[PDB]
Every structure is written in C-alpha cells, then in structure tokens.
Amino acid sequence: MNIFEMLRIDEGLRLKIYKDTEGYYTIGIGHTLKVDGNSNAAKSELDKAIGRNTNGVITKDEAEKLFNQDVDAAVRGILRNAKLKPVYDSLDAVRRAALINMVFQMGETGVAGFTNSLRMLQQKRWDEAAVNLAKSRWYNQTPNRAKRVITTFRTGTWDAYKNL
C-alpha cells in the first residue's frame, strides 16, 4: 500500500468539476483549481491543464494523469526543499508517505512551516510531534484526514487506512 492508495482514500474521485469544503473548485483526486470565481473560470483552467474543451468533465485516465503529476510534484518539492529534504531522508517509507500527503494537500511551503514539528519527526519523537500537529490550523481544518495522517506518523504503520 502506498501513497497513491493513501491519497485515493483521502481525497476521493470526481470526474466533473466540483467545489470542496474549502470552497475551491476541484476535480479528479483532490486536484484543485487555483482559480477565483465562476465555474467557467474553473473550466478554462481545467481545459488548460487538460488541453481540451472539457466542460468540467474528465475521463478516468485524465484523472489518473493529473494524480500522477501532482504527486510527482509533491515529491519533487520535498526533494528540492532544503527544509523538508533532511526530514524526508530521515523517515521510514510509511512515514515518508505521510510526509507526502501533507505536502500534497498543503504545499511544500506550508509544510516547511511546521518548524518545530518537523524537528521532532526528524528526531524520531513521534508522539511529541503527533501531539504538536494536533494544534494547528491544518489539523483543525480537516480533523479526520489529519487524524489519519497523524496516526501514521505516530505509529509508523498503515493502520489508520487499513480496510479503508
């Protein structure tokens, strides 16, 4: 079980443009449209990333391509980020996966911002960090998912995602 599986569950699939809890338009597997207003607007953007008049509807494969891109992009940021890289290099797979998930959902520069919590994972101080993240707007914004991502960090296992 990997990161792809992990985010599938954490973000779900949608083949027709939609608005998330956060308000933003979304499509595929949690692939957001960093676009303001009108769905149209959203669409244009989509169409752009897709290279076709889409009408806010895409195929599964098109959804898969975006997924792949976004992930590679999460990973590439961690790999090029001087603040995240050391940490990453430090964890176990599972724990790396958790790392990705966060960058994936919140961006490399958002993650890089958990200064102290990053330190704690880096010093294998699981619970402390665990607990530390538990404040956070992040956590506070999406409690179930974070919960999941946090437990992973905590236990270093795939329990949180087990049967689903």
Confirm if 83 and 116 have CB atoms less than 8 A apart: no
135, 146, 137, 69: which is closest to 102 by C-alpha? 146
* Distances in whole angstroms, Cα of residue 88 to Cα of each of 6, 110, 130: 17, 15, 16
- Which of 9, 50, 63, 91 is close enough to bind Cl ion by CB under 5 A? 63
11 noted as active-site residue: yes
**Is residue 42 a contact point for Cl ion (CB under 5 A)?**
no
Confirm if 70 and 32 have CB atoms less than 8 A apart: no
- Which of 3, 6, 66, 118 is close enough to bind Cl ion by CB under 5 A? 66
Q: Rounded to the nearest whole angstrom, what is the least distance from the CB of residue 13 to Cl ion in the complex?
A: 8
- Which of 45, 49, 67, 150 is close enough to bind Cl ion by CB under 5 A? 67
Q: Give the binding site for Cl ion (CB under 5 A).
A: 28-29, 31, 63, 66-67
Positions marked catalytic: 11, 20
